[PDB]
Amino acid sequence: IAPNLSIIIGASTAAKIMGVAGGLTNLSKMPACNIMLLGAQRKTLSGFSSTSVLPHTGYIYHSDIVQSLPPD
Amino acid sequence: RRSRHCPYLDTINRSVLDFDFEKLCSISLSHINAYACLVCGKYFQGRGLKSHAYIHSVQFSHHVFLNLHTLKFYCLPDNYEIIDSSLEDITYVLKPTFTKQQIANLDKQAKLSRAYDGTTYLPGIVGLNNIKANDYANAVLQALSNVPPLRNYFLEEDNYKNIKRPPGDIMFLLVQRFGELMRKLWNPRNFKAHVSPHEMLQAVVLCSKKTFQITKQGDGVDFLSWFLNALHSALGGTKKKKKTIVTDVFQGSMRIFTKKLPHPDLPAEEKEQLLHNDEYQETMVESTFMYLTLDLPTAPLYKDEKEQLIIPQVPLFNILAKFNGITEKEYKTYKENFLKRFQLTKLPPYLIFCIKRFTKNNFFVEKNPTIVNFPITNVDLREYLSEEVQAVHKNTTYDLIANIVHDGKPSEGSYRIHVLHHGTGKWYELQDLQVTDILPQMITLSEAYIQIWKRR
């Protein structure tokens, strides 16, 4: 269904970001800035720095491709 | 004869008797006729009028005592023998009478035993008391326990008396005290769920001299290397017993091919002629091992670029890959290096894996905290033997039995032991008196130091 998107990020995260976005047509009308925050949990900071508990982090930030890189 | 009945039977206190101390007179420092009071639990010199036991009996009004040699009870203030049905239980504590059926019906035992104090436990799974830096001693004693070939030779006192003891034999006390301690810990019915090796570390420090002093934490590998050797040497007086009860259990034949002078200081042509000389080549160096040594990769020494401070996990088969003709280790020493390749030619019934964690650098001794991923109930070692020997063994699979894990720096350590209760699968963690049925994953997560196997 989405050969181009399923190879950059992998089909798993591809499904996680297309299902939550309301479909491929829905996210095609969506800016990349908003596509970053797809499934971005507003995790409750447990008395920590907001940097420690990843703020503004979405499924794309948890994809295998990005996690291969150093945290910075 | 009022000997059989006594009006002082109830005064006996069973939870106070701590029979793990030295059986020498407290008042006058003697081992002869060591008599123990049952009311309070003190040692004395023996029976007789105006004797230390008699003086205590007529002073504290403690009547019924116990003989530690004849195992026959006495009432000292009138000094007559005492016989009772219930009292027999006490005699089972200091000298447990493990008849052969109880040995034969102990690997099939799955009932938690009863202690007088109420502290439940399983036999064999017993906490050895850490009096003074006995963590390594307790660890090695527990690891040596749970070995059925060694388990079935010491639960009976009639196994090691018949051995020949020369006039200069000064190490049989080690064997007999090991046997007695094992009987104390393997006891189904004892007042305390723990046991003190107080009578055992004394024999250890007598046989090993000041070495392995209980003041400072000893080294596990350095310990059992001497301990198994001492057990082998004690069994047999003035008679070469190449195979004794401990030799045919852990010892295995090993082949070594060793080449020497590979030193880089030699030029290419000179080294080519040297290997051409046929003087410096692989040699027939077959010998015996009491335990297989495991050499680990060095610590990463650097943070991983993605996940900093990554824990180094190495599969066990990488370590065991040393024992084959494929790999060869350079045990360099003094001026010239020595390239040795190892090989296995006789798998012992139980395989011991010592792990070289603690090593001295050029300046200071450190530890190698490299975790190892190792299975516990399925491993194959058939690739490490020559086929002309592989046909002999139809069992090359081993199951873990005991595991040793060390804590912290060499100068500050605290041994912990993972024991497998045979018959069941409960892996129990013992440090000093700890008892906890862990899962088969915490054994992999922790860093192992000494492993015990079974070829089945």
XYZ file of C-alpha atoms in Angstrom:
528
model
C 0.000 0.000 0.000
C 2.864 2.419 0.825
C 6.115 0.973 -0.556
C 7.971 4.291 -0.338
C 7.043 5.111 3.261
C 7.431 1.527 4.505
C 11.142 1.394 3.609
C 12.429 4.667 5.097
C 11.101 3.984 8.597
C 10.101 0.337 8.358
C 6.582 -1.051 8.070
C 6.028 -1.314 11.835
C 6.519 2.363 12.677
C 4.921 3.091 9.299
C 1.743 1.385 10.497
C 1.972 3.104 13.878
C 2.166 6.521 12.194
C -0.422 5.905 9.469
C -3.060 4.331 11.707
C -2.931 7.136 14.268
C -2.869 9.872 11.607
C -6.238 8.796 10.195
C -4.964 7.241 6.976
C -2.403 7.957 4.279
C -4.629 10.645 2.756
C -5.005 12.342 6.147
C -1.265 12.484 6.852
C -0.538 13.534 3.261
C -2.338 16.766 4.201
C -0.213 16.934 7.372
C 3.010 18.954 7.716
C 6.188 17.117 8.667
C 6.322 19.121 11.900
C 3.004 17.575 12.926
C 4.078 14.157 11.630
C 6.936 14.309 14.136
C 4.444 14.474 17.010
C 2.401 11.481 15.841
C 1.786 9.456 18.979
C 3.775 11.919 21.099
C 2.848 10.967 24.651
C 2.677 13.848 27.126
C 4.643 11.812 29.645
C 4.339 13.138 33.192
C 7.780 14.246 34.353
C 8.503 12.416 37.612
C 10.322 15.217 39.387
C 12.948 15.295 36.635
C 14.221 17.715 34.034
C 11.852 17.853 31.075
C 14.842 16.951 28.896
C 15.290 13.627 30.709
C 11.772 12.414 29.870
C 11.867 13.044 26.085
C 9.514 16.044 25.509
C 7.818 16.553 22.083
C 8.903 13.005 21.027
C 6.817 10.973 18.518
C 6.805 7.514 16.915
C 9.304 8.797 14.343
C 11.728 9.566 17.183
C 11.324 5.967 18.401
C 11.949 4.485 14.947
C 14.896 2.157 14.418
C 16.628 4.505 11.962
C 16.925 7.471 14.339
C 17.791 5.421 17.433
C 20.892 4.134 15.631
C 22.335 7.634 16.001
C 23.940 9.135 19.132
C 21.469 10.800 21.525
C 22.630 14.311 20.630
C 18.389 -48.242 88.834
C 16.750 -44.839 88.353
C 19.005 -44.306 85.314
C 16.277 -44.594 82.676
C 13.901 -42.051 84.222
C 14.823 -38.482 85.132
C 12.872 -35.656 86.809
C 14.934 -33.109 84.870
C 14.086 -34.068 81.271
C 12.020 -30.943 80.550
C 14.743 -28.510 81.667
C 16.683 -29.269 78.460
C 16.738 -26.362 76.000
C 17.075 -27.504 72.392
C 17.364 -24.075 70.734
C 20.410 -23.069 72.799
C 22.629 -26.042 71.859
C 25.056 -24.655 69.259
C 27.242 -27.675 68.487
C 29.282 -25.835 65.824
C 31.929 -24.584 68.272
C 35.235 -26.257 69.069
C 34.661 -29.303 71.279
C 37.220 -28.311 73.898
C 36.677 -27.600 77.584
C 35.882 -23.947 78.222
C 37.053 -23.840 81.844
C 40.294 -25.820 81.560
C 41.088 -26.097 77.822
C 40.846 -29.822 77.146
C 39.228 -32.109 74.585
C 39.088 -35.183 76.838
C 35.576 -36.177 77.950
C 34.021 -33.019 76.521
C 30.669 -32.883 78.334
C 28.032 -30.323 77.347
C 25.338 -28.955 79.637
C 21.844 -29.017 78.145
C 20.218 -26.355 80.341
C 22.485 -23.534 79.130
C 24.917 -25.099 76.643
C 28.469 -24.909 78.005
C 31.392 -27.297 77.590
C 33.207 -29.039 80.432
C 35.979 -31.515 81.136
C 33.958 -34.606 82.052
C 32.342 -36.554 84.861
C 33.651 -37.299 88.341
C 33.464 -35.708 91.781
C 34.621 -32.075 92.048
C 34.928 -32.064 88.256
C 34.214 -28.961 86.194
C 30.979 -30.477 84.903
C 30.137 -31.621 88.438
C 30.964 -28.187 89.875
C 28.748 -26.508 87.277
C 25.965 -29.021 87.949
C 26.055 -28.380 91.706
C 26.426 -24.606 91.193
C 23.934 -23.755 88.423
C 21.655 -26.684 89.410
C 21.937 -27.946 85.821
C 21.466 -31.703 86.067
C 21.214 -33.466 82.695
C 24.306 -33.205 80.466
C 25.509 -34.782 77.220
C 28.608 -36.768 76.259
C 30.196 -35.745 72.956
C 32.158 -38.991 72.474
C 29.963 -41.845 73.727
C 26.791 -39.880 72.831
C 25.209 -41.119 76.074
C 23.422 -38.672 78.347
C 24.183 -38.273 82.043
C 22.885 -36.666 85.229
C 26.118 -35.435 86.857
C 24.850 -34.247 90.296
C 24.103 -37.909 90.988
C 26.089 -39.053 87.915
C 23.956 -41.743 86.298
C 23.163 -42.491 82.663
C 19.956 -41.104 81.136
C 17.923 -42.839 78.414
C 14.806 -41.289 76.865
C 12.891 -41.734 73.621
C 12.509 -38.042 72.755
C 16.066 -37.127 73.785
C 17.402 -39.264 70.915
C 16.529 -36.402 68.553
C 19.383 -34.357 70.031
C 21.850 -37.143 69.238
C 20.767 -36.869 65.594
C 21.991 -33.253 65.420
C 25.675 -33.453 66.342
C 26.131 -36.885 64.701
C 23.510 -37.352 61.966
C 23.198 -41.050 61.116
C 22.636 -40.982 57.353
C 22.060 -44.618 56.495
C 22.508 -45.566 52.850
C 18.768 -45.455 52.145
C 18.632 -41.773 53.129
C 21.443 -41.011 50.680
C 19.606 -43.056 48.047
C 16.324 -41.263 48.871
C 17.622 -37.684 48.952
C 17.904 -36.745 45.271
C 14.199 -37.686 45.084
C 13.279 -35.539 48.102
C 10.903 -32.589 47.666
C 9.613 -31.971 51.215
C 10.746 -28.893 53.120
C 12.443 -29.999 56.327
C 11.553 -28.887 59.849
C 13.793 -26.954 62.232
C 13.265 -26.697 65.981
C 13.414 -22.890 65.831
C 10.745 -22.977 63.102
C 12.991 -21.609 60.352
C 11.980 -23.752 57.386
C 14.554 -24.910 54.849
C 15.673 -27.631 52.462
C 18.630 -29.898 53.257
C 21.812 -28.932 51.476
C 20.330 -25.476 50.944
C 21.705 -24.209 54.254
C 23.340 -20.913 55.161
C 26.956 -21.165 56.279
C 27.672 -18.654 59.042
C 30.105 -15.872 58.084
C 32.061 -15.524 61.320
C 35.006 -13.628 59.824
C 35.497 -13.134 56.067
C 34.224 -16.642 55.311
C 32.354 -15.550 52.169
C 34.797 -17.308 49.836
C 35.015 -20.348 52.126
C 31.231 -20.600 52.353
C 30.985 -20.177 48.578
C 33.472 -22.938 47.775
C 31.992 -25.276 50.392
C 28.481 -24.807 48.992
C 29.696 -25.209 45.402
C 31.548 -28.398 46.344
C 28.279 -29.516 47.895
C 25.393 -30.458 45.583
C 27.830 -32.755 43.740
C 26.195 -36.214 43.919
C 29.470 -38.076 43.241
C 30.967 -36.124 46.145
C 27.607 -36.023 47.944
C 27.436 -39.811 48.278
C 30.893 -40.276 49.846
C 30.723 -38.095 52.975
C 27.205 -38.522 54.391
C 28.431 -41.783 55.979
C 31.250 -41.753 58.529
C 32.354 -45.254 57.430
C 33.749 -44.031 54.092
C 37.038 -42.299 54.965
C 38.259 -43.939 58.185
C 39.572 -47.024 56.360
C 42.090 -44.949 54.373
C 45.739 -45.341 55.343
C 47.064 -42.456 57.439
C 50.877 -42.217 57.707
C 52.458 -41.203 61.027
C 53.156 -37.777 59.511
C 49.609 -37.403 58.157
C 48.454 -33.964 59.335
C 45.609 -33.379 56.870
C 43.061 -36.143 57.553
C 41.348 -33.714 59.931
C 40.419 -31.700 56.833
C 38.611 -34.678 55.292
C 36.854 -35.776 58.476
C 35.748 -32.234 59.351
C 34.472 -31.692 55.808
C 32.470 -34.894 56.182
C 31.070 -33.935 59.576
C 30.137 -30.425 58.396
C 28.423 -31.876 55.330
C 26.436 -34.207 57.582
C 25.478 -31.208 59.739
C 24.220 -29.188 56.767
C 22.545 -32.145 55.013
C 20.668 -32.871 58.251
C 16.879 -33.112 57.754
C 16.318 -32.308 61.456
C 18.478 -29.661 63.127
C 17.660 -26.948 65.649
C 19.011 -24.141 63.442
C 18.322 -23.774 59.726
C 21.908 -22.477 59.397
C 25.244 -24.052 60.315
C 28.542 -22.516 61.377
C 31.792 -23.642 59.711
C 33.608 -22.613 62.900
C 34.888 -26.187 63.239
C 35.854 -26.189 59.533
C 37.795 -22.941 59.048
C 40.021 -24.073 61.919
C 40.978 -27.228 60.023
C 41.386 -25.084 56.899
C 43.838 -22.729 58.619
C 45.664 -25.646 60.258
C 46.189 -27.572 57.013
C 46.868 -24.492 54.864
C 48.911 -22.766 57.625
C 48.489 -18.981 57.887
C 47.546 -18.975 54.186
C 43.825 -18.455 53.539
C 43.660 -16.661 56.878
C 40.071 -15.850 57.832
C 41.159 -12.272 58.533
C 41.308 -11.336 54.836
C 38.950 -12.347 52.034
C 40.558 -15.209 50.122
C 40.515 -15.963 46.407
C 38.013 -18.568 45.252
C 40.074 -20.046 42.415
C 43.254 -20.069 44.493
C 41.176 -21.724 47.207
C 39.638 -24.672 45.388
C 42.872 -25.285 43.468
C 44.469 -26.128 46.822
C 41.302 -27.630 48.328
C 40.713 -30.328 45.712
C 44.449 -31.068 45.673
C 44.421 -31.491 49.464
C 41.373 -33.764 49.288
C 43.123 -35.858 46.626
C 46.394 -36.050 48.579
C 44.790 -36.848 51.948
C 42.919 -39.844 50.510
C 45.766 -42.352 50.352
C 48.793 -42.789 52.608
C 52.186 -43.789 51.185
C 50.324 -45.140 48.145
C 49.968 -43.348 44.812
C 46.202 -43.102 44.259
C 46.118 -41.435 40.845
C 42.317 -41.879 40.894
C 40.478 -41.104 44.134
C 36.903 -40.038 44.872
C 37.585 -36.437 43.812
C 39.931 -37.190 40.897
C 37.469 -39.278 38.872
C 34.845 -36.521 39.321
C 36.435 -33.202 38.305
C 39.782 -34.165 36.747
C 39.904 -34.469 32.981
C 42.653 -35.226 30.515
C 43.812 -32.260 28.451
C 46.032 -31.914 25.385
C 48.269 -28.890 24.799
C 50.279 -28.090 21.676
C 52.896 -25.466 22.539
C 55.185 -23.514 20.212
C 57.886 -21.214 21.564
C 60.135 -18.370 20.417
C 57.642 -16.542 18.149
C 59.197 -13.367 19.501
C 59.083 -10.335 17.159
C 62.741 -9.562 17.921
C 63.598 -12.433 15.583
C 63.668 -11.406 11.896
C 61.560 -13.170 9.294
C 64.335 -15.381 7.900
C 65.625 -16.349 11.352
C 62.135 -17.314 12.538
C 61.540 -19.243 9.304
C 64.743 -21.203 9.916
C 63.786 -21.642 13.582
C 60.478 -23.264 12.652
C 62.504 -25.142 10.030
C 64.863 -26.381 12.764
C 62.100 -28.778 13.944
C 63.197 -28.019 17.528
C 60.452 -25.455 18.294
C 57.076 -26.921 17.317
C 53.833 -28.225 18.784
C 54.542 -30.785 21.499
C 52.808 -33.637 23.328
C 51.862 -31.960 26.618
C 48.847 -34.015 27.712
C 48.151 -33.673 31.440
C 45.237 -33.467 33.880
C 43.046 -30.579 35.003
C 41.048 -30.257 38.203
C 39.050 -27.401 36.636
C 38.857 -25.655 33.268
C 39.964 -22.019 33.248
C 38.008 -19.402 31.296
C 39.737 -16.317 29.886
C 37.422 -13.369 29.153
C 37.790 -10.454 26.739
C 39.087 -7.271 28.318
C 36.642 -4.609 29.464
C 35.500 -2.275 26.655
C 37.465 0.630 28.207
C 35.342 2.980 26.082
C 31.734 4.107 25.967
C 29.758 2.785 23.022
C 29.038 5.573 20.553
C 25.252 5.093 20.713
C 24.519 3.688 24.194
C 27.228 4.929 26.542
C 28.680 2.576 29.167
C 27.316 -0.528 27.462
C 27.453 -3.741 29.490
C 29.771 -6.281 27.783
C 27.797 -9.482 27.195
C 29.724 -12.359 25.600
C 28.273 -15.803 24.782
C 29.751 -18.724 26.699
C 30.673 -20.591 23.507
C 33.108 -17.804 22.593
C 34.972 -18.460 25.845
C 34.790 -22.240 25.436
C 36.077 -21.825 21.868
C 39.547 -21.622 23.431
C 39.521 -25.404 23.988
C 39.928 -26.466 20.368
C 42.656 -26.655 17.758
C 41.169 -23.672 15.921
C 42.180 -21.080 18.527
C 45.537 -20.663 20.275
C 46.387 -18.289 23.133
C 49.783 -16.634 23.657
C 50.692 -17.145 27.323
C 53.717 -14.877 27.038
C 56.134 -15.152 29.956
C 59.562 -13.607 30.671
C 61.595 -13.177 27.461
C 59.919 -15.442 24.881
C 56.224 -15.904 24.170
C 54.527 -19.312 24.309
C 51.695 -20.028 21.863
C 49.538 -22.832 23.286
C 46.475 -24.479 21.758
C 44.225 -26.509 24.056
C 42.169 -29.644 23.488
C 39.915 -31.959 25.492
C 40.451 -35.728 25.513
C 38.518 -36.896 28.603
C 35.458 -35.077 29.900
C 35.096 -35.546 33.675
C 31.645 -36.442 35.035
C 31.352 -32.897 36.418
C 33.038 -29.981 34.651
C 34.263 -27.038 36.732
C 34.587 -23.639 35.046
C 36.737 -21.158 36.932
C 36.579 -17.618 35.571
C 39.584 -15.270 35.520
C 37.964 -12.072 36.756
C 40.687 -10.780 39.085
C 43.979 -10.021 37.344
C 47.004 -7.871 38.134
C 47.979 -5.138 35.693
C 51.465 -3.702 35.398
C 50.634 -1.550 38.447
C 47.425 -2.524 40.281
C 45.106 -5.533 40.394
C 41.668 -5.034 38.849
C 38.672 -7.198 37.941
C 37.215 -8.013 34.522
C 33.455 -7.314 34.911
C 32.471 -8.891 31.577
C 29.035 -10.492 31.815
C 28.612 -13.868 30.108
C 25.426 -15.229 28.530
C 25.416 -18.931 29.398
C 22.656 -21.565 29.315
C 21.981 -23.821 32.292
C 20.288 -26.986 30.953
C 21.570 -27.504 27.385
C 25.149 -27.205 26.114
C 27.133 -29.278 23.610
C 30.907 -29.721 23.878
C 31.458 -32.370 21.185
C 33.382 -29.997 18.891
C 36.204 -29.712 21.457
C 37.317 -33.368 21.289
C 39.153 -35.361 18.643
C 36.921 -37.861 16.859
C 39.253 -40.719 17.830
C 38.078 -39.853 21.358
C 34.571 -38.491 20.612
C 33.264 -42.022 20.027
C 33.977 -43.025 23.637
C 31.652 -40.412 25.167
C 27.928 -40.642 24.428
C 27.187 -37.739 26.819
C 28.753 -34.335 26.107
C 25.847 -32.290 27.516
C 26.160 -30.529 30.872
C 23.658 -28.865 33.204
C 24.624 -26.107 35.626
C 24.540 -26.977 39.336
C 26.274 -24.212 41.304
C 27.335 -20.679 40.415
C 29.630 -18.203 42.172
C 29.117 -14.441 41.846
C 31.485 -11.879 43.374
C 30.755 -8.312 44.478
C 32.824 -5.151 44.163
C 36.580 -4.712 44.372
C 38.990 -7.539 45.273
C 39.751 -5.970 48.662
C 36.019 -5.603 49.439
C 34.119 -8.681 48.291
C 31.007 -10.616 49.277
C 30.466 -13.971 47.583
C 27.003 -15.172 46.585
C 26.045 -18.692 45.551
C 23.362 -19.997 43.186
C 22.585 -23.621 44.092
C 20.298 -25.959 42.155
C 18.234 -28.323 44.302
C 18.349 -31.565 42.329
C 15.026 -33.240 41.670
C 13.383 -29.822 41.636
C 14.486 -26.775 39.650
C 14.562 -24.147 42.389
C 17.720 -22.042 42.076
C 18.482 -20.606 45.516
C 20.721 -17.634 46.347
C 22.854 -17.937 49.493
C 25.292 -15.255 50.638
C 25.591 -15.827 54.400
C 22.102 -17.087 55.360
C 20.120 -15.829 52.355
C 17.483 -18.130 50.852
C 15.614 -17.038 47.721
C 14.227 -19.113 44.845
C 15.444 -17.079 41.862
C 14.387 -17.577 38.239
C 16.707 -19.066 35.582
C 17.350 -15.568 34.179
C 18.994 -13.899 37.186
C 21.655 -16.592 36.847
C 22.449 -15.285 33.355
C 22.233 -11.591 34.263
C 24.829 -11.782 37.044
C 28.540 -12.158 36.319
C 29.666 -15.717 37.030
C 32.966 -16.590 38.684
C 32.890 -20.378 39.267
C 30.449 -22.784 37.595
C 29.651 -26.440 38.328
C 28.191 -28.778 35.696
C 27.000 -32.381 35.329
C 27.430 -34.571 32.251
C 24.360 -36.712 33.096
